[PDB]
Amino acid sequence: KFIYGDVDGNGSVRINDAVLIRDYVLGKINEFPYEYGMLAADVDGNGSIKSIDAVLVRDYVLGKIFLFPVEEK
């Protein structure tokens, strides 16, 4: 059903998901193009969408990590 990091709801975590988060944090856009986008976007799991969320999604794409902080323990 939803995947952490996938804020556009296409089924894959990609670079544009990171940039959507970033553009949301910066106030360039005001929502995500996906009904579970807000849920998918809070990948550090601290309850808000912040610059670090976009960095963590980039790190997923780079292959630095497989699990997001929201997913561990």
Binding site: I15, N16, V19, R22, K28, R58, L62, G63
Partner: protein, 143 residues
Amino acid sequence: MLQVDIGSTSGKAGSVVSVPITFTNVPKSGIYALSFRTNFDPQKVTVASIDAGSLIENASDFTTYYNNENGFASMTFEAPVDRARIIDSDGVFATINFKVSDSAKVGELYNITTNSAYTSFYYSGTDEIKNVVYNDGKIEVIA
């Protein structure tokens, strides 16, 4: 259509070779974001370093990583939100510097291939560049 070439080269066992990643026929409307991941056999080559190419105007836009255990090298570009810098012209995006194994044999040919799951190109935050064509890379071991 955007053409993305992993370059080919040749080198001897134990040397460092350079594999540039070249973009041709870049759309005039520009690339706002991309990721590019190459796979390789880490028993044959390892990544020594990745350098920004001349398409990268500001290093804060460009991030890289590699894993010599599982065999991939990744690169990302993210344009600034005000679109002050955008890749809208042709050139070298990045160069991967590969170390050829000490046990490499003359006449072996190693393949550097595009990983489609972790590679994508975007006009904007929502619109993918869909018809990109990719050409993988060859490293030939010579004497």
